[PDB]
Scaffold this active site. Sequence first.
Site, PDB file in Angstrom:
ATOM      1  N   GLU A   2      40.158  35.052  19.619  1.00 18.56           N
ATOM      2  CA  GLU A   2      41.306  35.169  20.517  1.00 18.56           C
ATOM      3  C   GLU A   2      42.215  33.945  20.378  1.00 18.56           C
ATOM      4  OE1 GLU A   2      40.994  34.710  25.131  1.00 18.56           O
ATOM      5  OE2 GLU A   2      41.230  36.894  24.680  1.00 18.56           O
ATOM      6  N   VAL A  53      34.792  47.204  23.418  1.00 23.31           N
ATOM      7  CA  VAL A  53      34.080  48.423  23.799  1.00 23.31           C
ATOM      8  C   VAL A  53      33.689  48.458  25.291  1.00 23.31           C
ATOM      9  CG1 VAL A  53      31.733  47.640  23.174  1.00 23.31           C
ATOM     10  CG2 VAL A  53      32.343  50.089  22.915  1.00 23.31           C
ATOM     11  N   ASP A 102      41.136  43.963  34.756  1.00 27.03           N
ATOM     12  CA  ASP A 102      39.785  43.886  35.304  1.00 27.03           C
ATOM     13  C   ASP A 102      39.901  44.012  36.831  1.00 27.03           C
ATOM     14  OD1 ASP A 102      37.337  43.143  36.497  1.00 27.03           O
ATOM     15  OD2 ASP A 102      36.825  41.845  34.820  1.00 27.03           O
TER      16      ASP A 102
END
Lengths: 288, 288
Positions: free
Chosen positions: B246, B155, B269
């Site tokens: 992960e 999110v 990012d």
Amino acid sequence: AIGEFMVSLPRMVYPQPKVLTPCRKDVLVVTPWLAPIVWEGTFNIDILNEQFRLQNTTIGLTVFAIKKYVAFLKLFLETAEKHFMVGHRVHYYVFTDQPAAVPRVTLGTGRQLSVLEVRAYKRWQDVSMRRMEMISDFCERRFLSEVDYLVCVDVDMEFRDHVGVEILTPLFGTLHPGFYGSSREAFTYERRPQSQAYIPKDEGDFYYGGAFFGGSVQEVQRLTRACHQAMMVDQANGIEAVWHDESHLNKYLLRHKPTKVLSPEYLWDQQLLGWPAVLRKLRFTAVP
Amino acid sequence: AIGEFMVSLPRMVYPQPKVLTPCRKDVLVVTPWLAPIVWEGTFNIDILNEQFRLQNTTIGLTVFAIKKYVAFLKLFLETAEKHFMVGHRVHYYVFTDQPAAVPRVTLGTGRQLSVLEVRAYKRWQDVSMRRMEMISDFCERRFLSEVDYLVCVDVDMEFRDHVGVEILTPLFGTLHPGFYGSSREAFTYERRPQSQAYIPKDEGDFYYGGAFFGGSVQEVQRLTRACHQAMMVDQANGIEAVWHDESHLNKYLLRHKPTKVLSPEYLWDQQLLGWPAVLRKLRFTAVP
């Protein structure tokens, strides 16, 4: 079987794929609809062999040998035994007007051959439509029970190199060796609007060869059914497409995009075209 | 629906794909197991949009927003409405401990949102396992009736550019932006043999990010079920994988290869990594 729960691959040691190094710098390796275009250097056959053997894959090969073309079967099958799907289950289906002329070729384990007689039709129209019609009838018959994928090829050919599970996908066509470098206006699609196979000058992705196509049984039954019905419409309208079932195959794969496209490595003619640097292997070739 | 009889595409005019021109010369666009790696320049979105709209495709997006992470939902959903699967049917599933904190975001036609409450577990272990457990339970519930594909994302992110049907396939992972140029020994896989997520130093194709994965509902139910059971084994054995779910996702996609891999365009990012020339678009990005 296909799409079935599949077990985990075993530990394997192989070179790491490098994200910032293209696998080929000289050719397109993916279509605009994200189907792989299969060239040497695009696949690790060890990984693919594991995936397909874990699924217990059976591949059917169909080939038609009519009249004098029976002479081509001995080399065709002998070379298939050396190069086609070795390690996997194979079922060859030889459609012929001469069951007794089929050569007795020795097969590896897990490989079988069925001879299916064809009706020696009176009318050239029923002859032209015969392959699509017959493939589509057997698709709804033996093929659905017996194999996972079907490959449909011409007999006047020989395998010279590996043709294996890299080609397997729901639906594939092969780039015709005469046109892979041509612009679309040069492709020999049917250009008369009165034909079901008509493709306009400004349309077309590739020119696919009628000598090598295939897929899952369901998708091959769809393609062949479509091409047969379209040919029947054309015959009622008194028109025959310029390249017969190859014209219909091209109209089909324009509107229903293949999930893999095979490079001309998979359909070549060395006599007419030589051995260009872009072809790292010549796998399946015209007999001169 | 998926894999269902699909109608013919309409006539479309677009540039001919050129077989002797690579679509990218700077990056790998296909894996060794012939899965496309999705970068800008590899797909014609007009063709793919037609294919998926003709199949009446519904895409579910799952997102977990727990404790202070509810603050991220307003920008996440607003930007999804601008950039995610526009033109297609979408169902957002927001899993949260705070149903009342979900912002009232205006949705386009054909797009709906469901809020699903999570149990605010006492033990951090049940928290760590919560996403895989919950995704896999709903997979066998609402998801199977309601959507064709599921996309599972973090999110604390925003969409900045197109994320559409190019990503859809039975099973996909995304290249983690920290590792797409690294050798495999540098990947932060779980390296302790006592963990179910263990991968040896000489194994591994890619480092996939836990923040963006997905597939058909059936394949996502398989992956999440597998990762949840594997995490439960580790907890019984008193070990927690280095990167939690992960790590398990990476062990899963090593043994069960994805049918598409998304480039780091899809998980980036900019604060930590900038805007390299190899990234032609930054589609889905960390919020600083």
